[PDB]
Amino acid sequence: ATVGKVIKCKAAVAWEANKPLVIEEIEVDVPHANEIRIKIIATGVCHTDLYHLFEGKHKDGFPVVLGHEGAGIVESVGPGVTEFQPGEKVIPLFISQCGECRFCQSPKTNQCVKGWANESPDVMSPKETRFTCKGRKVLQFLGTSTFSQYTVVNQIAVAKIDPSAPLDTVCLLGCGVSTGFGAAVNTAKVEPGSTCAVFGLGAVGLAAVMGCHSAGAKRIIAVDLNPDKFEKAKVFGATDFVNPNDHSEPISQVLSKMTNGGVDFSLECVGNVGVMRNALESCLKGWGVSVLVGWTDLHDVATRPIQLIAGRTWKGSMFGGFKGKDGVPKMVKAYLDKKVKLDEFITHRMPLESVNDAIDLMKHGKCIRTVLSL
Amino acid sequence: ATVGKVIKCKAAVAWEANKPLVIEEIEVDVPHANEIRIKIIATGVCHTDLYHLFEGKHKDGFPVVLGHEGAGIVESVGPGVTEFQPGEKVIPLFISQCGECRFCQSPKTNQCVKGWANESPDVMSPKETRFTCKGRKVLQFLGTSTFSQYTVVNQIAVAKIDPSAPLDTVCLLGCGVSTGFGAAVNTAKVEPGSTCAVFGLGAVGLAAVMGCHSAGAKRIIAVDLNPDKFEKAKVFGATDFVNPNDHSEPISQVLSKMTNGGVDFSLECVGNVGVMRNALESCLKGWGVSVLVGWTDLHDVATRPIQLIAGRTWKGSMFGGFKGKDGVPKMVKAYLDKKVKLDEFITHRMPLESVNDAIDLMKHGKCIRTVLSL
Ligand SMILES: NC(=O)c1ccc[n+]([C@@H]2O[C@H](COP(=O)([O-])OP(=O)(O)OC[C@H]3O[C@@H](n4cnc5c(N)ncnc54)[C@H](O)[C@@H]3O)[C@@H](O)[C@H]2O)c1
Ligand SMILES: NC(=O)c1ccc[n+]([C@@H]2O[C@H](COP(=O)([O-])OP(=O)(O)OC[C@H]3O[C@@H](n4cnc5c(N)ncnc54)[C@H](O)[C@@H]3O)[C@@H](O)[C@H]2O)c1
Ligand SMILES: [Zn+2]
Ligand SMILES: [Zn+2]
Ligand SMILES: [Zn+2]
Ligand SMILES: [Zn+2]
C-alpha cells in the first residue's frame, strides 16, 4: 500500500518554541537517492529535545518534529540504495558516517564532514525536509525526527541491527545509552582494575557506570545530589555512593580522601561547569583522565593550569565516540547476549499522544527514560 | 680541601621580592644523608626564576638563591650515597625520582611523592636549606639553587652524565631544553607527517620546535609577537612564521584558515592563560591535542565545553615528561652524537656578578638563553 507513494500519518509537531507539541497528520515524501523511509516503532525522550523546545531563539529551527532515540523497520529505499531493503530493523543516528572522509577513516574519532552539524548546526536540522503539514514544511530534528510514525533518513545516518532485536527497548541506543557507555569505554578508555567516579546519575550517568563496569573497573564511585538515584546505580555496577550535600568540603576533597589522592578516570554526566571542574580535580595527578559528557554552553569551564601540568588529561565526546554504523549493531548484540542492560533504564512508557506528559516528567527530573509507542 | 667542612662562597641572593639580586658570601653546610654537594660551573637563566621574583612573589619564599638550570662536578657526598663520587659530572633537577613510589614505577608519568612541590609548593622551595648568610637562613629555589658556586641537592634530584660532556652547554638540559623538546615528543606525542603550532619562541618554545622536527612533523608553525625570534625558529626546523599583530582576526582563526580546520598538535610556551586558550582552539576537531607548558598560578585557564566535546584533548607537561635521572643522561648522549642542538640556544654568556643584566635581558625578550660562569 505505502511503497512508492507519499504517506499520511501522525506526528508530534513543535510549531514554535515554548509551546506544547500538537499531534498532527503529516505527509511523508518518498525516499530520494541514498535515503531510506522507516516506520518507527518506539522512541525515547531526551534532554536535547527539550533544550531545543525551551532554549531556541532560532526561529528557523521551527516548525519541527523532534526525537532522536528511535528504532524501526525499513519500509522502502530510494534510488541507488542497495545497502538496505524493506523489512530490516534499523536505528537512525544523529551524526553521520560517510565512510570516505579524513575523519571517517581515522580510528581516533567518530567525526565526519557530512550531516546537518556541518551543513546547518544553527537550526539543529538539515536544510532539506521530507515532511509537510497543512501546506507548511516541517523540519526534521537532527535528521532523525523520531516523534513521527514514519521518517526518512540518509543512509550514512542509519544502522542496520539484529532481526530479533526488541524495538521498544533498543531504541535508547540512538542516543542516551551509547553516550554514557561509550564515553567510558571509547573516550576515557577505562582499564581493568582501575578506580572511577561518575557525576550525575540520570540515563547518561547510569550508562557511564555500566561502561566503567564493562571495562572492568575495580571501584566505581557514583556521585549525585539526589540519594534516591543510588539503588539503580548499584544495579548498574557502582560500588560506592556519595552525596555532595553530606560533606562541608568540596566534593573533590572528599573523593580525594576516599581514594588517596583521586580516581583514575572520572566522567561528568550533569552538564554543569562547576561539576566539570570538580570532576577533573577529583582525578589523580600523573595519569588521571576526565571526560566531559554532559554539555552546556552558556558558561566557560575552567581550572588552574597546575591541574593539567601535574599530569591530568581533559577530554570530551559526542555519542560516546561511537562510529554509529559499526557501534550500534555491536551494542544491540551485546544486549541480546546479556552483556548490556537496557530495560532497567525505562521507568515510564506512554503513547505518542502523551508526549507533553513525558516532557513534563523529564523537565522535573521525575524519571530516567520514558519510551513512547507510535 | 673542603670535604667535611662548611664552605664559604659567592651566591646571588634575593633578599625580597621585586628587588635586584646581591652577590653575597654565604656558608654552604655539609651534605646531610642522601645529599650531594656540587660545584656549579654554569647555569642558564629561566623565566620561572623571574616568575617568583616578579610575579608570584610568595611572601614566605624569601630570602632565596634562585637558579635551576645548571651543570657541575660533585664535590662531596653525604652518608648513604654510593652512586656519586667526587669529580663526576652532574645536572641537578627541580623534580624528584625516588624510584620506589607508584608514580616513579609507572611509564605514564614523571611524578613522584618526594620534593619541595609535595611539601612547600606555594613557597617554591623546600622547608630545609643548607644556605646561611649574615646569620640568616636562605632558601634554595626548587631544591636546586644554581646561582651559587656550590649547592646541595638530594640524590634523587640529581642526574649523572657523560664524562666528556661540556658543562657550559649541557646545563640547558637542567630545565629549558628538556622541557620544550619533551613536551612535544613525550607529552603531545607528535607524529611523523603531522602539522604542529608552537606559541612563544623563547628557549622552551624553540626546544618545542626542535622536538616537533625530530618527531618528523611535516609543518611547524612558529607564533610570537616579537618577530626577531623567527630566525632562530627557522634554525630549529620551523616551516611557517606568524606574528599575531599582523592579523586582524584572532590568532586561532588565522591558523585554522592556514590549515583547513586547525593543526594536529599545538603547544603553549609563554605562561599566559589567554595564550593557553588560543593554542587549544587552534587545534583541529576530532584528534587535536594541545599541551600546556607555560607556568602561572595566579589565574584560571578556560574554554567552552564544545571545544573538547568536538574531539580535542588538553594536557599539561612538567619537565617535558622526562623522568629526571633517566631522560637527562640520554639527552646528553644525543647532543654528543649530533642528534640534538644545544649551542644555538646560547646567545649570551657573562659572569655571575652580571646576574641582574641577564635577568633584564630576559625581562625584555632580548635573548634566548644567557649562560653564567661562576
Ligand atoms: N555528549 C553527548 O553526546 C550528549 C548527548 C545528549 C545529552 N548529553 C548530556 O547529558 C546530560 C545529562 O543527561 P541525563 O538525561 O542523564 O540527565 P538527567 O537530568 O536525567 O540526570 C542528571 C543527574 O545529575 C544530577 N546532578 C545535578 N547536579 C548535580 C551536582 N551538582 N552534583 C552531582 N549530581 C548532580 C541530578 O540529580 C540528576 O540525577 C545533559 O546535561 C546533556 O547535556 C550529552
Ligand atoms: N612546565 C615546566 O616544567 C616549565 C619549564 C620551564 C619553563 N616554564 C615556563 O615556560 C614559559 C616560557 O619560558 P621561557 O624561559 O622560554 O620564556 P621567555 O620569556 O624566554 O619566552 C617567552 C616568549 O613568549 C612570547 N610571547 C609572549 N606573549 C606572546 C603571545 N601573546 N603570543 C605569542 N608569543 C608570545 C615572548 O615574546 C617570548 O619570546 C614561562 O611561563 C616559564 O615560567 C615551565
Ligand atoms: Zn565521513
Ligand atoms: Zn540525545
Ligand atoms: Zn625553568
Ligand atoms: Zn618517586
Coordinates of N, CA, C and O in Angstrom, one line a residue, chain B residues 201-281:
Chain B
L201 N 58.3 31.8 21.5 CA 59.6 31.4 21.0 C 60.9 31.8 21.8 O 61.8 32.4 21.3
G202 N 60.8 31.4 23.1 CA 62.0 31.6 24.0 C 62.7 30.3 23.9 O 62.4 29.5 23.0
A203 N 63.5 30.0 24.9 CA 64.2 28.7 24.8 C 63.3 27.5 24.9 O 63.4 26.5 24.2
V204 N 62.2 27.6 25.7 CA 61.2 26.5 25.8 C 60.5 26.3 24.5 O 60.3 25.1 24.0
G205 N 60.0 27.4 23.9 CA 59.3 27.3 22.7 C 60.2 26.8 21.5 O 59.8 25.9 20.7
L206 N 61.4 27.3 21.5 CA 62.4 26.9 20.5 C 62.8 25.4 20.6 O 63.1 24.7 19.6
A207 N 62.8 24.9 21.8 CA 63.1 23.4 22.0 C 61.9 22.6 21.6 O 62.0 21.5 21.1
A208 N 60.7 23.2 21.8 CA 59.4 22.5 21.4 C 59.5 22.4 19.8 O 59.1 21.3 19.3
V209 N 59.9 23.4 19.2 CA 60.0 23.4 17.7 C 60.9 22.3 17.3 O 60.6 21.5 16.4
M210 N 62.1 22.2 17.9 CA 63.1 21.1 17.7 C 62.5 19.7 17.8 O 62.7 18.9 17.0
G211 N 61.7 19.5 18.9 CA 61.1 18.3 19.2 C 60.1 17.9 18.0 O 60.1 16.7 17.6
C212 N 59.3 18.8 17.6 CA 58.4 18.6 16.5 C 59.2 18.2 15.3 O 58.7 17.3 14.5
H213 N 60.3 18.8 15.0 CA 61.1 18.5 13.9 C 61.7 17.0 14.0 O 61.6 16.3 13.1
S214 N 62.2 16.7 15.2 CA 62.7 15.4 15.5 C 61.7 14.3 15.3 O 62.0 13.2 14.7
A215 N 60.5 14.5 15.7 CA 59.4 13.6 15.6 C 58.9 13.4 14.1 O 58.1 12.5 13.8
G216 N 59.4 14.2 13.2 CA 59.1 14.2 11.8 C 57.8 14.9 11.3 O 57.3 14.4 10.2
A217 N 57.4 15.9 12.0 CA 56.3 16.7 11.6 C 56.5 17.3 10.2 O 57.6 17.7 9.9
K218 N 55.4 17.4 9.4 CA 55.5 17.9 8.1 C 55.4 19.5 8.1 O 56.1 20.1 7.2
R219 N 54.7 20.1 9.0 CA 54.6 21.5 9.1 C 54.7 22.0 10.5 O 54.0 21.5 11.3
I220 N 55.5 23.0 10.8 CA 55.7 23.5 12.2 C 55.6 25.0 12.1 O 56.4 25.7 11.5
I221 N 54.5 25.6 12.6 CA 54.2 27.0 12.6 C 54.7 27.7 13.9 O 54.2 27.2 15.0
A222 N 55.6 28.6 13.8 CA 56.1 29.4 14.9 C 55.3 30.6 15.1 O 55.1 31.4 14.2
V223 N 54.8 30.9 16.4 CA 54.0 32.0 16.7 C 54.5 32.9 17.8 O 54.7 32.4 18.9
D224 N 54.8 34.2 17.5 CA 55.3 35.1 18.5 C 55.0 36.5 18.1 O 55.0 36.8 16.9
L225 N 54.8 37.4 19.1 CA 54.5 38.8 18.9 C 55.8 39.5 18.5 O 55.8 40.6 17.9
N226 N 57.0 39.0 18.9 CA 58.3 39.5 18.6 C 58.9 38.7 17.5 O 59.5 37.6 17.7
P227 N 58.8 39.3 16.3 CA 59.3 38.7 15.0 C 60.9 38.5 15.0 O 61.3 37.8 14.0
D228 N 61.6 39.0 15.9 CA 63.1 38.8 16.0 C 63.4 37.4 16.3 O 64.5 36.9 16.0
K229 N 62.5 36.6 16.8 CA 62.7 35.2 17.1 C 62.5 34.2 16.0 O 63.0 33.1 16.0
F230 N 61.9 34.7 14.9 CA 61.7 33.8 13.7 C 62.9 33.2 13.1 O 62.9 32.1 12.6
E231 N 64.0 33.9 13.1 CA 65.3 33.5 12.5 C 65.8 32.2 13.2 O 66.2 31.2 12.6
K232 N 65.8 32.2 14.6 CA 66.1 31.0 15.4 C 65.1 29.9 15.2 O 65.4 28.7 15.3
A233 N 63.8 30.3 15.0 CA 62.8 29.3 14.9 C 63.1 28.5 13.6 O 63.0 27.3 13.6
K234 N 63.6 29.2 12.6 CA 63.9 28.5 11.3 C 65.1 27.6 11.5 O 65.2 26.5 11.0
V235 N 66.1 28.1 12.3 CA 67.3 27.3 12.6 C 66.9 26.0 13.2 O 67.4 24.9 12.8
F236 N 65.9 26.0 14.1 CA 65.4 24.8 14.8 C 64.4 23.9 14.0 O 63.9 22.9 14.6
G237 N 64.1 24.3 12.8 CA 63.2 23.5 12.0 C 61.8 23.9 11.6 O 61.0 23.2 11.1
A238 N 61.4 25.2 12.0 CA 60.1 25.7 11.7 C 59.9 25.9 10.2 O 60.8 26.3 9.4
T239 N 58.7 25.7 9.7 CA 58.4 25.9 8.3 C 57.5 27.1 8.0 O 57.6 27.6 6.9
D240 N 56.8 27.6 9.0 CA 56.0 28.8 8.9 C 56.2 29.8 10.0 O 56.6 29.3 11.1
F241 N 55.9 31.0 9.8 CA 56.2 32.0 10.8 C 55.0 33.0 10.9 O 54.7 33.6 9.9
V242 N 54.4 33.2 12.0 CA 53.3 34.1 12.2 C 53.4 35.0 13.4 O 53.7 34.6 14.5
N243 N 53.2 36.3 13.1 CA 53.2 37.3 14.2 C 51.7 37.7 14.3 O 51.2 38.2 13.4
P244 N 51.1 37.4 15.5 CA 49.7 37.8 15.7 C 49.3 39.2 15.4 O 48.3 39.4 14.8
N245 N 50.2 40.2 15.6 CA 50.0 41.6 15.4 C 49.7 41.9 13.9 O 49.2 43.0 13.6
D246 N 50.1 41.1 13.0 CA 50.0 41.3 11.5 C 48.6 40.8 11.0 O 48.4 40.8 9.8
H247 N 47.7 40.4 11.9 CA 46.4 40.0 11.5 C 45.3 40.6 12.4 O 45.5 40.7 13.6
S248 N 44.2 41.0 11.7 CA 43.1 41.5 12.4 C 42.3 40.4 13.1 O 41.8 40.7 14.2
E249 N 42.2 39.2 12.5 CA 41.4 38.0 13.1 C 42.2 37.5 14.3 O 43.4 37.6 14.4
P250 N 41.4 36.8 15.2 CA 42.0 36.2 16.3 C 43.0 35.2 15.8 O 42.7 34.6 14.8
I251 N 44.1 35.0 16.5 CA 45.1 34.0 16.1 C 44.6 32.6 15.7 O 45.1 32.0 14.7
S252 N 43.6 32.1 16.5 CA 43.1 30.8 16.3 C 42.5 30.7 14.9 O 42.5 29.6 14.2
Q253 N 41.9 31.7 14.4 CA 41.2 31.8 13.1 C 42.3 31.8 12.0 O 42.1 31.2 10.9
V254 N 43.4 32.5 12.2 CA 44.5 32.6 11.2 C 45.0 31.2 11.0 O 45.1 30.7 9.8
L255 N 45.3 30.5 12.1 CA 45.9 29.1 12.0 C 44.9 28.2 11.3 O 45.2 27.4 10.4
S256 N 43.6 28.2 11.8 CA 42.6 27.3 11.2 C 42.6 27.5 9.7 O 42.6 26.6 8.9
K257 N 42.5 28.8 9.2 CA 42.4 29.1 7.8 C 43.7 28.6 7.1 O 43.6 28.1 5.9
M258 N 44.8 28.6 7.7 CA 46.1 28.2 7.1 C 46.1 26.7 7.0 O 46.9 26.2 6.1
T259 N 45.4 26.0 7.8 CA 45.4 24.5 7.8 C 44.1 23.8 7.3 O 44.1 22.6 7.3
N260 N 43.0 24.6 7.1 CA 41.7 24.0 6.7 C 41.1 23.3 7.9 O 40.6 22.2 7.8
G261 N 41.1 24.0 9.0 CA 40.4 23.5 10.2 C 41.2 23.6 11.5 O 40.5 23.7 12.6
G262 N 42.5 23.4 11.5 CA 43.3 23.5 12.7 C 44.4 22.5 12.6 O 44.4 21.7 11.8
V263 N 45.4 22.7 13.5 CA 46.6 21.8 13.4 C 46.4 20.6 14.2 O 45.4 20.5 15.1
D264 N 47.2 19.6 14.0 CA 47.1 18.3 14.7 C 47.6 18.4 16.1 O 47.0 17.8 17.0
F265 N 48.7 19.1 16.3 CA 49.3 19.3 17.7 C 49.7 20.7 17.9 O 50.1 21.4 16.9
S266 N 49.5 21.2 19.1 CA 49.9 22.6 19.5 C 50.5 22.6 20.9 O 50.2 21.7 21.7
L267 N 51.3 23.6 21.1 CA 51.9 23.8 22.5 C 52.1 25.2 22.9 O 52.6 26.1 22.1
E268 N 51.7 25.5 24.1 CA 51.8 26.9 24.6 C 53.0 27.0 25.5 O 53.2 26.2 26.4
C269 N 53.9 27.9 25.2 CA 55.2 28.0 25.9 C 55.5 29.5 26.3 O 56.5 30.0 26.0
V270 N 54.5 30.1 27.0 CA 54.6 31.5 27.4 C 54.3 31.8 28.9 O 55.0 32.5 29.5
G271 N 53.2 31.1 29.4 CA 52.8 31.3 30.8 C 51.7 32.3 30.9 O 51.5 33.0 31.9
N272 N 50.9 32.4 29.8 CA 49.8 33.3 29.8 C 48.5 32.6 29.5 O 48.3 31.9 28.5
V273 N 47.5 32.7 30.4 CA 46.2 31.9 30.3 C 45.5 32.2 29.0 O 44.8 31.3 28.5
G274 N 45.6 33.4 28.5 CA 44.9 33.8 27.3 C 45.5 33.0 26.1 O 44.8 32.6 25.2
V275 N 46.8 32.9 26.1 CA 47.5 32.2 25.0 C 47.2 30.7 25.1 O 47.1 30.0 24.1
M276 N 47.1 30.2 26.3 CA 46.8 28.8 26.6 C 45.4 28.4 25.9 O 45.3 27.3 25.3
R277 N 44.5 29.3 26.0 CA 43.1 29.1 25.4 C 43.2 29.1 23.9 O 42.6 28.2 23.3
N278 N 44.0 30.0 23.4 CA 44.2 30.2 21.9 C 44.8 29.0 21.3 O 44.5 28.6 20.2
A279 N 45.8 28.4 22.0 CA 46.6 27.2 21.5 C 45.6 26.1 21.4 O 45.6 25.4 20.3
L280 N 44.8 25.8 22.4 CA 43.8 24.8 22.4 C 42.8 24.9 21.2 O 42.7 23.9 20.4
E281 N 42.3 26.1 21.0 CA 41.3 26.3 20.0 C 41.9 26.4 18.6 O 41.1 26.4 17.6

